[PDB]
């Protein structure tokens, strides 16, 4: 499995977007707390 946001394939816990798509613990947790998708470099 992979994260729709950060594409990581390594994470302690997988989460799902309010639709059902896989997000990593961090990305999923970040959105849940702040309301927006976790922003990345580059």
């Amino acid at each position: 499995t992979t994260c729709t946001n950060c594409f990581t394939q390594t994470t302690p816990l997988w989460r799902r977007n309010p639709e059902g798509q896989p997000l990593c613990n961090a990305c999923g947790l970040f959105l849940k707390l702040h309301g927006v998708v976790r922003p990345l470099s580059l």
Binding site: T10, T11, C24, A26, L33, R38, P39, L42
Partner: protein, 318 residues
């Protein structure tokens, strides 16, 4: 509740950049100071909407500081020894912040002063941050002090000092350092976790963190363990080699040398703990509560290391 305006300096630095991307994203307005508008990160920080930059030096430039804190409710301050004398810079910023009178939470990134806990000397790029910390407290600024664990992304195969993951000929990686092989060290994934953690601290407010020191480290691994992380995360064989002295393979600046020499003595010759403060002698507890979506050395090594190397000009992974 409401998103506030945050003041930051050294925007291109790893701690700040992390906070800026995250904060801007969730809705906060950012007022940051950069040394130069030239550079990838700089241009990037420029591409983010609610981010205002002020190009100029920090040393003896109280005007930049005044402007920086105008309308600011929050501030994350992490200076570099390169910008000049950290104590004087760190004190001018604190004075400006107080003169602005609108700062509700002032987070300063501080570092220990080892000589205060043993015949150990003072790590030059670390010690002065403790003086600024005390001065922040002295002004009465509602504050919180964060102590960053060693960056995960300091690692590189390139001949950079202290944290080189040199690519030997036998298709393996060796890491040369003074740090004791079996002594757990405090690590931190700058890009991935500084931002979110800082946000949480702000969301909590000084009503919770005012006066506190927070070890910004989400996992403690010994050098052997760090290498076991890479070796188990890249199919390669990775070994740690303890060397009494740090290897400088590239023309670096003065300040940076002396800093390394201090490290050799403190960790190599005295085996003195990274965070010699008693409260820091589990340390990672406060951090992991502040933010649980942390990236450990295994994920960093398997998901980021290979990428940073590539864009850096290497194909060993391909």
């Amino acid at each position: 509740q409401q998103k506030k305006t945050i003041a930051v300096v050294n925007a291109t630095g790893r701690q700040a950049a992390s906070l800026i991307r995250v904060a801007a994203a969730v809705g906060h307005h950012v007022r940051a100071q950069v040394h130069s508008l030239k550079g990838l990160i700089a241009e990037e920080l420029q591409a983010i909407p609610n981010v205002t930059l002020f190009q100029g030096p920090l040393l003896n430039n109280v005007p930049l500081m005044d402007t920086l804190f105008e309308g600011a409710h929050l501030a994350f301050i992490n200076t570099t020894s390169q910008a000049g004398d950290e104590i004087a810079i760190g004190k001018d910023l604190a004075d400006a912040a107080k003169r602005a009178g609108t700062i509700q939470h002032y987070i300063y990134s501080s570092m220990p002063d080892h000589s205060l806990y043993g015949p150990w000397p003072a790590v030059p790029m670390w010690a002065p941050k403790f003086t600024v910390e005390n001065y922040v407290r002295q002004l009465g600024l509602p504050s919180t002090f964060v102590y960053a664990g060693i960056y995960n992304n300091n690692f590189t195969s390139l001949p950079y000092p202290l944290f080189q993951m040199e690519l030997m000929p036998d298709g393996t990686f060796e890491w040369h350092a003074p740090f004791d092989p079996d002594i757990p060290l405090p690590w931190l994934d700058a890009e991935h976790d500084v931002g979110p953690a800082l946000l949480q601290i702000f969301k909590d407010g000084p009503q919770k963190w005012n006066g506190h020191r927070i070890a910004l480290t989400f996992e403690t691994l010994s050098p052997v363990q760090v290498c076991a992380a890479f070796s188990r995360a890249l199919n390669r064989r990775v070994t740690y080699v303890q060397v009494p002295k740090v290897e400088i393979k590239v023309n670096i600046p003065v300040g940076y040398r002396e800093q390394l020499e201090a490290i050799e003595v403190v960790f190599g010759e005295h085996k003195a703990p990274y965070f010699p403060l008693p409260e820091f002698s589990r340390v990672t507890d406060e951090a992991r509560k502040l933010w649980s979506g942390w990236r450990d050395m295994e994920e960093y090594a398997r998901e980021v290391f290979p990428i940073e190397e590539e864009a850096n000009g290497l194909d060993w992974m391909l």
